[PDB]
Amino acid sequence: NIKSAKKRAIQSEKARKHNASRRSMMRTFIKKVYAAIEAGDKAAAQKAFNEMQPIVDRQAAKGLIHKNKAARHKANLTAQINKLA
Amino acid sequence: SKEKFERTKPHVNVGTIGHVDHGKTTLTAAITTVLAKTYGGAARAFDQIDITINTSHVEYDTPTRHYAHVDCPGHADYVKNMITGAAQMDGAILVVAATDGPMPQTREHILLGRQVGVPYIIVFLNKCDMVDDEELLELVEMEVRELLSQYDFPGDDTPIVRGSALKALEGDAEWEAKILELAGFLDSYIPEPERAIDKPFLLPIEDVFSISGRGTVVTGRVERGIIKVGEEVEIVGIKETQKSTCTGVEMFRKLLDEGRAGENVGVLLRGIKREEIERGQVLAKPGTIKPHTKFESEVYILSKDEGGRHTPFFKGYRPQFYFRTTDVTGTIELPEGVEMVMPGDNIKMVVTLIHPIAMDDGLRFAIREGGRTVGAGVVAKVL
Amino acid sequence: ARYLGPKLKLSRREGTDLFLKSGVRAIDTKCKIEQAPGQHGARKPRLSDYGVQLREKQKVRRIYGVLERQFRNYYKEAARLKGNTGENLLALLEGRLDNVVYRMGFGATRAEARQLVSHKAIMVNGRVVNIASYQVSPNDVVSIREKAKKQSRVKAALELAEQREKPTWLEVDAGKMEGTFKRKPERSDLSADINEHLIVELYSK
Amino acid sequence: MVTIRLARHGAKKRPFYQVVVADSRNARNGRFIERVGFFNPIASEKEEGTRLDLDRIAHWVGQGATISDRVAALIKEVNKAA
RNA sequence: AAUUGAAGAGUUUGAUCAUGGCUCAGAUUGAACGCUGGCGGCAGGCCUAACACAUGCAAGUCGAACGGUAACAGGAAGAAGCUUGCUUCUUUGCUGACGAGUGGCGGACGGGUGAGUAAUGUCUGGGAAACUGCCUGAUGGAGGGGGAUAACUACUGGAAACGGUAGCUAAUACCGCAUAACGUCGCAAGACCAAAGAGGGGGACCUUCGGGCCUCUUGCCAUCGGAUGUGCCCAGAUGGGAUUAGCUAGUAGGUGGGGUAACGGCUCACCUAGGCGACGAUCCCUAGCUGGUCUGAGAGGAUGACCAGCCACACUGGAACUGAGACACGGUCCAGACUCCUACGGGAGGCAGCAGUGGGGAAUAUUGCACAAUGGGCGCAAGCCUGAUGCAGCCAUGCCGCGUGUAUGAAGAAGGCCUUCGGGUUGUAAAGUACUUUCAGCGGGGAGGAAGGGAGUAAAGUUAAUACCUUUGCUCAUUGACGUUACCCGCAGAAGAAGCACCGGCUAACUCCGUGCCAGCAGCCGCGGUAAUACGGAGGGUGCAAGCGUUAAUCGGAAUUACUGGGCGUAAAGCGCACGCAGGCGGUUUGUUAAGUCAGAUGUGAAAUCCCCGGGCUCAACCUGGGAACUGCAUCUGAUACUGGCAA
RNA sequence: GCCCGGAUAGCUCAGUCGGUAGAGCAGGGGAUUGAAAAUCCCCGUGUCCUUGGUUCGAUUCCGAGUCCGGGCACCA
Numbered sequence A: 001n002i003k004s005a006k007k008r009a010i011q012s013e014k015a016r017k018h019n020a021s022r023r024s025m026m027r028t029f030i031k032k033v034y035a036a037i038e039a040g041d042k043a044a045a046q047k048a049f050n051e052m053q054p055i056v057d058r059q060a061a062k063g064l065i066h067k068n069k070a071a072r073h074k075a076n077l078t079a080q081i082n083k084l085a
Numbered sequence B: 001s002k003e004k005f006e007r008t009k010p011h012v013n014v015g016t017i018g019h020v021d022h023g024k025t026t027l028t029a030a031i032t033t034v035l036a037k038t039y040g041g042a043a044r045a046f047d048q049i050d051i052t053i054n055t056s057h058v059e060y061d062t063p064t065r066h067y068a069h070v071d072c073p074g075h076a077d078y079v080k081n082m083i084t085g086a087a088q089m090d091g092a093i094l095v096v097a098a099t100d101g102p103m104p105q106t107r108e109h110i111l112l113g114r115q116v117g118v119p120y121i122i123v124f125l126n127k128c129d130m131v132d133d134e135e136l137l138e139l140v141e142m143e144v145r146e147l148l149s150q151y152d153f154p155g156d157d158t159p160i161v162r163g164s165a166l167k168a169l170e171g172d173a174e175w176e177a178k179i180l181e182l183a184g185f186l187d188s189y190i191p192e193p194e195r196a197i198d199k200p201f202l203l204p205i206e207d208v209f210s211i212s213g214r215g216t217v218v219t220g221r222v223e224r225g226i227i228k229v230g231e232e233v234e235i236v237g238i239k240e241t242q243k244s245t246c247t248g249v250e251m252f253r254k255l256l257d258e259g260r261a262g263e264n265v266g267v268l269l270r271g272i273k274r275e276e277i278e279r280g281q282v283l284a285k286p287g288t289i290k291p292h293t294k295f296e297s298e299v300y301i302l303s304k305d306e307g308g309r310h311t312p313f314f315k316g317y318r319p320q321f322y323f324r325t326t327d328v329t330g331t332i333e334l335p336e337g338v339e340m341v342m343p344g345d346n347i348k349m350v351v352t353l354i355h356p357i358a359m360d361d362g363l364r365f366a367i368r369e370g371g372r373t374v375g376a377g378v379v380a381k382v383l
Numbered sequence C: 001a002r003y004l005g006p007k008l009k010l011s012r013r014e015g016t017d018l019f020l021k022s023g024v025r026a027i028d029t030k031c032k033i034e035q036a037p038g039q040h041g042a043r044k045p046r047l048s049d050y051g052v053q054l055r056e057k058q059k060v061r062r063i064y065g066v067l068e069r070q071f072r073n074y075y076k077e078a079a080r081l082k083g084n085t086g087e088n089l090l091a092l093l094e095g096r097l098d099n100v101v102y103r104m105g106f107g108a109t110r111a112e113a114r115q116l117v118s119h120k121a122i123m124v125n126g127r128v129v130n131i132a133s134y135q136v137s138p139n140d141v142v143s144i145r146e147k148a149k150k151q152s153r154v155k156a157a158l159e160l161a162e163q164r165e166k167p168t169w170l171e172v173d174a175g176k177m178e179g180t181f182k183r184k185p186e187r188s189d190l191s192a193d194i195n196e197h198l199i200v201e202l203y204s205k
Numbered sequence D: 001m002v003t004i005r006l007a008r009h010g011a012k013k014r015p016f017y018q019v020v021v022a023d024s025r026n027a028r029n030g031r032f033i034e035r036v037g038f039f040n041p042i043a044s045e046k047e048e049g050t051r052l053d054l055d056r057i058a059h060w061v062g063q064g065a066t067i068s069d070r071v072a073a074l075i076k077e078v079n080k081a082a
Numbered sequence E: 001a002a003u004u005g006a007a008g009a010g011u012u013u014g015a016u017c018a019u020g021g022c023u024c025a026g027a028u029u030g031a032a033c034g035c036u037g038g039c040g041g042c043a044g045g046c047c048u049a050a051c052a053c054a055u056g057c058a059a060g061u062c063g064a065a066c067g068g069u070a071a072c073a074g075g076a077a078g079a080a081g082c083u084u085g086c087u088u089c090u091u092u093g094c095u096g097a098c099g100a101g102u103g104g105c106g107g108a109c110g111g112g113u114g115a116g117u118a119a120u121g122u123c124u125g126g127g128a129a130a131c132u133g134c135c136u137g138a139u140g141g142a143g144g145g146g147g148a149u150a151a152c153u154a155c156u157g158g159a160a161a162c163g164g165u166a167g168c169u170a171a172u173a174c175c176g177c178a179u180a181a182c183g184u185c186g187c188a189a190g191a192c193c194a195a196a197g198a199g200g201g202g203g204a205c206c207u208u209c210g211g212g213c214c215u216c217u218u219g220c221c222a223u224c225g226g227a228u229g230u231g232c233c234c235a236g237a238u239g240g241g242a243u244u245a246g247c248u249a250g251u252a253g254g255u256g257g258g259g260u261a262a263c264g265g266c267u268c269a270c271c272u273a274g275g276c277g278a279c280g281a282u283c284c285c286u287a288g289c290u291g292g293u294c295u296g297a298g299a300g301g302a303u304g305a306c307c308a309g310c311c312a313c314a315c316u317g318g319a320a321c322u323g324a325g326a327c328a329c330g331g332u333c334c335a336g337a338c339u340c341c342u343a344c345g346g347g348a349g350g351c352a353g354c355a356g357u358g359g360g361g362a363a364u365a366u367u368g369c370a371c372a373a374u375g376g377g378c379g380c381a382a383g384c385c386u387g388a389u390g391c392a393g394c395c396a397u398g399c400c401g402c403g404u405g406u407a408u409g410a411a412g413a414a415g416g417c418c419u420u421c422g423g424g425u426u427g428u429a430a431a432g433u434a435c436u437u438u439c440a441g442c443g444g445g446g447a448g449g450a451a452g453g454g455a456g457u458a459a460a461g462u463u464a465a466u467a468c469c470u471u472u473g474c475u476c477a478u479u480g481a482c483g484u485u486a487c488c489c490g491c492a493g494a495a496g497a498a499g500c501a502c503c504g505g506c507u508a509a510c511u512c513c514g515u516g517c518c519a520g521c522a523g524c525c526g527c528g529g530u531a532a533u534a535c536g537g538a539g540g541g542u543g544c545a546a547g548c549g550u551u552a553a554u555c556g557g558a559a560u561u562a563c564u565g566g567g568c569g570u571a572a573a574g575c576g577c578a579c580g581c582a583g584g585c586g587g588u589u590u591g592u593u594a595a596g597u598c599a600g601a602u603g604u605g606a607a608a609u610c611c612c613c614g615g616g617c618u619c620a621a622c623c624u625g626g627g628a629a630c631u632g633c634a635u636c637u638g639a640u641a642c643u644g645g646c647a648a
Numbered sequence F: 001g002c003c004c005g006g007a008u009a010g011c012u013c014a015g016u017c018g019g020u021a022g023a024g025c026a027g028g029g030g031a032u033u034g035a036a037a038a039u040c041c042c043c044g045u046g047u048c049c050u051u052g053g054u055u056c057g058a059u060u061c062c063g064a065g066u067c068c069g070g071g072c073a074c075c076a
């Protein structure tokens, strides 16, 4: 619309491209650990978590993730690696 | 809507009158085309005006004055629109074809404006590109001069401007040369008319419009008085006399702030619909004229060879009465002793109209009936 | 809002005097009283009970110059108070400022007294009042604006009140032309010739 | 963040301010938490013209409730020392 | 002081007493119609088409964030006239300030509508599996580097909208490195994660001459909090129809994975076959809820406009993004309908935001002024935006207040009218006469709504500091849309200001004349058939008053839905009879429990409204302090007569 | 504003192509009665919307205008 606050359109959409790109990369790491559980390598699964731990934690402080869901992945997946090992 | 209109150029209301196929419309678009190259606020297109059946009012202005042109219907079947078209004349332009010469109907166009009082006429002898023989142009010109001479006008002193509206509209300099000198005749033969601005306000209701989204915009050129946006002005018509207040005024889609005599403006009222107001009423000052159903007058009836009647009518005869914009008919009670009123009589008659409207003494008016003008006069008595 | 008509015609209806025409004279004596409420006034009424309830209200309401809608509100306030609802109506109707100045004698008649108030002439406690329906409070002093004192209307007016009863719920000075209001009006301190009992039953329905 | 503002009541041309404790995101004369004292700028030169309970203000200030500059001016206007 | 409160009449029949419907007497409304119309004060004002909309306006802001400055105003260098500093004036971001751009914040509030919604909502009272920007308390940190881009140049697509390519550069933009904790995961050991700098002032020192450094202010990150808001779950209450009786299958529940801030069929995979239903499911229709308003003695019934709290919608439908928060009125993407522009390839638009318009409709108004006050957003502040709000204009729509004059005045006139033609009546009514002057009209003084803010200045703290800054007094010029204000003084003349329904009974109040079951009146009973108090006119009179009546609507009367408070032999009404489940009710003695119940305490029952006592506008209407009330619910602690559960 | 349809006694219509306007349903006036019906005795009350013209002559010929209804516009 014809308002000076149409800035929020292009600006927030520019924010959409950035945030969306970061959200997929966070998820693909989780796909690695789920493949790790199906692979049966409890040591490699532990190693799988070794690269994604500083990932979601760095997303937590940015407000990108609600911080609660961040710790939630670190909970169940830990429960997964001890289920196999 | 927008664009505040400037009150700098003197405004003289003009207009081309003529006949069918003559070129009233052709010249209208051409004059603005000619004035287009002297000022970039003109050049009214041919499809802009449109035969022109409605009283089309476009404008053009020279670097000296401003003009409100009217493109009236030069047709006999559209005399009533022509009458109201002549309701804003400060000077006119007669379009006469040098091919079929001055027509008896074009002759009729002169007399209708005369009984309502046209001050000056700039006769544009049209269709000049049809013939270059000057003596043939002279006889057609002199016949128009003869026409105005026997019709109480300076036919011997009427400014005859030759020319063809055809190529003048095409942009041909030679024929555009006539149009430039045409404007020369308009500013000299027609001086600044009378505009009684300090008189009680009166504005004839000519046309009714409704701009979708803004309201009612009635129009007309003010005869006298001054109005301001916010002032309460009432309306007297054939219906019950009503009232309203001014909420705006834009001329030619250009804003104005004060209504004054001379300017053909479009005033904006306080939320009235279309079914209340119609052509014929009068926008005036609070409590000036009240309607009546009984009045007398002093009228004269002309001959049919000139344009009036030929046979004497009787009592009960019901002709339409016209005072600058009114078309109210009425039952006539003839004076005792005069059963038959022959063409040439200058008697009085008691009138009992059918739709009450502004009736006041000293009201110069004309009378018509059946398609012809029976005569004119002045309302001296109001019962 | 006022009557603005013949001040004796309505009084001839009731038969009882309403003091609308007291003036300098004591009693009229020439109005063909008690037997002429109008044209066919000689014939005595059927006197239905519904009418007699109306006859006391219309009698008393014209005494104070109050009108129906306003008189109904005095009643509305009368019911929400304590004591006697019948006597509540009496004190409030006397509570009007035009009524208290009427007992002082500063006004010959109430119609005279009403404009007296309405023309900024009365200045109670040093406060000018135009409202005749001003609810007078206990323990206060009413007075007259100096510009509007001894203006020929009050001259002949004060000597009239000498034959009046001059109630005990107030006191006039007439030396400085001032009025001091005492305690609230008692039922026995008023005329007591009217029957206000029927009025509370009138608005019962 | 809640604050101590002024709820402008009273009729046309003759107001009467009622100092309230309300939410910032709410309306002037709308939802609030509590009302404490009032403010009568058109009061007569008489007994009462301005009232306000200092303690309830301090209790809310203790959690972090801000005060409007006009309202905070009333604190100076009620003169805690005078 | 705080509910001191309840009326009936007419009409069935020849008459009566019942039963029983019908109608009127009351008050009110977001009103409308008709007639008339003086002003002021305080409110209200599109209920129908949630129908379609022109234009303007309704949300911007920070240089104390950054690169910059196209403009406006100066400094400064310079330059030209020529009065040699009086002017003209080309460069210059070095300043004041600053369009356009980046970025932070706001835009989720304020505002409007009631289409949808019968329970996802709302109200009432509890509850736990959460989140929480701006604000604020507590405790530490605030170390060090890198890579792009907009604006801007060059070129260029397209009518425009709106882009495209290659290069330019900064940051409180983005992305790392380091450091990690009472923070996160885990039994633990351990592992892992953050950030941003500017502005003012200034001494020594230092100055690659940008500045560091010191100090003050402010901002930044994380964590436990708190205040507040929001989300979620349960219980009770929240309409009509049974001529709607079976419904449901991600549906009832469980295990596991995922998702959500959080819990869960929220969603999937397998398994189980159940869950809802007469104290009414589903289905159909209708409808925003409540606080309240009107009526009512109360209980109830009706209703939900305005002020206020909540929910939902935003052209129709749908999805999602950003962010603390929307799944969003003045944001986006898609399809559809309706408008518009067009250079026909393709785009623009949403008034149920103020006004305003066509149309609908019986019917509801201005395209005003201003940010002076309160509130909101950004900002250090100054200010700026603010159709919130504050006021003004139109309308008798409501309530309240007031005026259209007072006193005197008998030939007891004129005229109208009636008449037993005697006279009566209009009627102190008028003229006449002596006075007054509100409000209107006009002319001058003159409140209050205004608290603050800016500059200057002293003192007290901060600090190396008499500086900056912060705080408290004081001084100066002051900030008012309304506004020819409120209010007051004064001048002129009774001067400018009364109508409307009704008059047989119900129901306060009559005759005459004219029309003859004709015309008409009318709430019901009924009037008029040639002597009408009911039709029409005139006079008189009654009621009310800038309003008066008609009409529509709700309640009252209606104890004609009876809970308080009705009936059934014949007036409306005992199933034809009987058995019997669910349900209702249940002798008497004792013990016991303490659910119903009772008393008391506690939390809650928002505010305004209604009630009592006071206060402020001349009074009132209206506004308003305090108290009371809010007749209900939840929990705790006692009591044991009655009812209920258990046992004899 | 433009273009048409109805405008015919109380009501609905016939009758035109210039030659002195009809019918039906009505309704009403009288004799009889307390008053009507039934019965009997009599019946047209019309500016053809109005007005003007080509006239020995116009409802019918050409037209304006007013009233009402039905379609199109125009957009200061």
Ligand SMILES: Nc1nc2c(ncn2[C@@H]2O[C@H](COP(=O)(O)OP(=O)(O)O)[C@@H](O)[C@H]2O)c(=O)[nH]1
Residues within 6 Å of the ligand: B019, B020, B021, B022, B023, B024, B025, B026, B027, B051, B052, B074, B126, B127, B128, B129, B130, B163, B164, B165, B166, B167
């Ligand atoms: N030769 C010539 N023809 C003309 C002239 N004016 C008009 N016309 C023609 O007449 C026709 C109609 O012209 P118009 O202006 O519509 O006339 P109106 O509307 O009756 O005024 C057009 O087609 C022109 O060609 C003229 O001056 N000369």
Ligand SMILES: *C(=O)[C@@H](N)Cc1ccccc1
Residues within 6 Å of the ligand: B055, B056, B057, B058, B207, B219, B220, B250, B251, B252, B253, B264, B265, B266, F076
């Ligand atoms: C509106 O434009 C008026 N000022 C002029 C006008 C034009 C056409 C018809 C009537 C008036």
